[PDB]
Write a protein that binds this ligand. Structure first.
Ligand SMILES: [Ca+2]
Ligand SMILES: [Ca+2]
Ligand SMILES: [Ca+2]
Ligand SMILES: [Ca+2]
Ligand SMILES: [Ca+2]
Ligand SMILES: [Ca+2]
Ligand SMILES: [Mn+2]
Ligand SMILES: [Mn+2]
Lengths: 188, 188
């Protein structure tokens, strides 16, 4: 009848998941939040591991993932923060939540915008996802083309509205914003 | 005790598959070789369908796939041609067989080499696989860079040895040359 307890029905009701899936996602939270300290919290030290271990997204954006999972900005991931953040990568999660998330992900230094050197590191990391590693000058052409397409109100930075326009023409930037195993989950 | 009959043990023994898998791949051959004519042969007309239907590789290279599946060059795919050609896309199939196949695939007009305009249509089709559709001038830079890297003995055409060198530095050109469901198959 414990501390940190959250009725699964609660999460269930604000997310694509269901009670059983929520209940199931607790099992996995316990694993990740106990590796090193056992305080019902995922320390960033322990996010690394679980991502390095059962590989999900990517190593150099684990600080970026950890950062946007950390919704109530307080340095750790709690269970409901984790379930609500994972729920965004669900197949049926509204595309608004996906676009927004993906933007928070890319705003590398957390400043409310996406700046040209963050577009670049992004584009590099997506390209290397699809096994393409390109010349430094192939890259700043692409990054230049992308940046003036995106930066509609012409002022050196992409805001959440121009992003939304940009992504509507470039839907593969939010490709990874969905993980299709999350439709029915796999015991382990 | 029929015509066109081939002991499954036979195929089994020259391929990554096993008797049961061979036996299972017969079921699927019957489907594809009967759609339109029922002569135990896959006519190209019927290759199209099955690829348009239960999607595998890609629509505009279905003529290229059909062409290299057609090993004994006689205009149709027979059962053992089909099993031996599919067996190449298997996870455990030797990488020689994969590189060779991929080369036959790209030699678009069937001339024994890969020519610059075939490298180009290739690169375009791989790029569009990974959701990248690029400028016509981003493209001939890439295609130019790739073509002089590949065409070692400097003479306007890639042969099977320079290809082999090229692919060793570019292992993602043979990415699709493997299909991981073929490790244990899925009834339907
Ligand atoms: Ca902990
Ligand atoms: Ca938090
Ligand atoms: Ca930023
Ligand atoms: Ca037929
Ligand atoms: Ca044939
Ligand atoms: Ca050719
Ligand atoms: Mn702007
Ligand atoms: Mn050559």
């Amino acid at each position: 009848r414990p501390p940190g307890y959250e009725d699964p029905e609660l999460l269930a009701s604000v997310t694509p998941f269901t009670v059983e899936e929520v209940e199931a996602l607790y099992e996995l939270f316990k694993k990740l939040s106990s590796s090193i300290i056992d305080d019902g919290l995922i320390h960033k030290e322990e996010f690394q591991l679980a991502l390095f271990r059962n590989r999900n997204r990517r190593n150099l954006f684990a600080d970026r993932i950890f950062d946007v999972f950390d919704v109530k900005r307080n340095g750790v991931i709690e269970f409901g923060e984790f379930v609500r953040s994972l729920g965004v990568f669900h197949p049926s999660a509204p595309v608004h939540e996906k676009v927004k998330f993906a933007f928070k992900l890319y705003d590398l230094r957390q400043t409310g915008f996406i700046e040209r050197e963050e577009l670049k590191e992004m584009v590099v990391a997506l390209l290397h996802e699809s096994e393409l590693v390109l010349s430094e000058d192939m890259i700043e052409v692409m990054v230049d083309k992308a940046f003036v397409q995106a930066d509609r109100k012409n002022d050196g930075k992409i805001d959440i509205d121009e992003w939304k326009d940009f992504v509507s023409l470039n839907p593969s930037l939010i490709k990874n914003m969905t993980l299709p195993y999350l439709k029915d989950i796999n015991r382990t």
